[PDB]
Amino acid sequence: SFSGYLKLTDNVYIKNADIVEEAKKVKPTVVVNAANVYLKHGGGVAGALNKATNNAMQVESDDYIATNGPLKVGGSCVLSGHNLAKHCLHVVGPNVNKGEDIQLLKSAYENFNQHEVLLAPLLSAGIFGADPIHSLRVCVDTVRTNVYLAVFDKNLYDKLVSSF
Ligand SMILES: C[C@@H](Nc1ncnc2[nH]ccc12)[C@@H]1CCOC1
C-alpha cells in the first residue's frame, strides 16, 4: 500500500512526505517514532504523531514509563499505533544536541530488524541534531528488513537523493 517511493537499495525506499500523513493514508503494521528515553512526545516526529492520536500515545507512554522506567539511548519499545498503525515502534536515536554518542545510531537502527516492514523517519536527524546524510547511510548499512522512509523537508529530501 506504499506509493510514490523512490527505491534506494534492495530493502530501503524514500519519499518526501510527512510521516503522520503517510501513516493516516497507509495504516501500516508498524510506524516508527523518533522517541526520547522518557517517551515525552513534545516536538518533531514524536510531537506530530502524538497530536494525531489526540494525546492517546502520550497517555499510554506515561503508563509504560511508570511501570518500566526509561528506555536506553539506542533502545526501543513496541506500543499501540492507535489510529495511525497497528503498532508504534518507539526508537531512541542519540540526540547530538544533548552530547549523546553518535555511535549509538547504528544500535538504534538495529531495532528495525525485528519487524518485516516499517514506515519510519531518519533517526537522530531534524531536532536531534545529527547529519541526515550520515543517518541515511547508517540506515542503509544496518537495516535488512523493508523500510519506507518519510522525509518531511523537501530541500533535505532532494539533497539526500542527489548525494546517495
Ligand atoms: C527528522 C525529520 N522529521 C520529520 N520527518 C518526517 N515526518 C515528520 N513529521 C514531523 C517531523 C518529521 C526531519 C525534519 C524535516 O524533515 C527531516
Swiss-Prot record:
Q: Can you say what this protein is called? A: Papain-like protease nsp3
UniProt catalytic activity:
Thiol-dependent hydrolysis of ester, thioester, amide, peptide and isopeptide bonds formed by the C-terminal Gly of ubiquitin (a 76-residue protein attached to proteins as an intracellular targeting signal)
Membrane association type: Multi-pass membrane protein
Q: Where in the cell is it found?
A: Host endoplasmic reticulum membrane
Please indicate which superkingdom the organism of origin belongs to.
Viruses
Please give the function described in this protein's UniProt entry.
Responsible for the cleavages located at the N-terminus of the replicase polyprotein. Participates together with nsp4 in the assembly of virally-induced cytoplasmic double-membrane vesicles necessary for viral replication. Antagonizes innate immune induction of type I interferon by blocking the phosphorylation, dimerization and subsequent nuclear translocation of host IRF3. Also prevents host NF-kappa-B signaling. In addition, PL-PRO possesses a deubiquitinating/deISGylating activity and processes both 'Lys-48'- and 'Lys-63'-linked polyubiquitin chains from cellular substrates.
State what inhibits or activates this protein. Inhibited in vitro by GRL-0617.
The gene coding this protein: rep
Effect annotated for changing S162L: In strain: Gamma/P.1
* Provenance organism: Severe acute respiratory syndrome coronavirus 2
Describe the protein's quaternary organization and the partners it interacts with: May form homohexamers. Interacts with N protein.
The chain positions of domain Macro read: 1-164
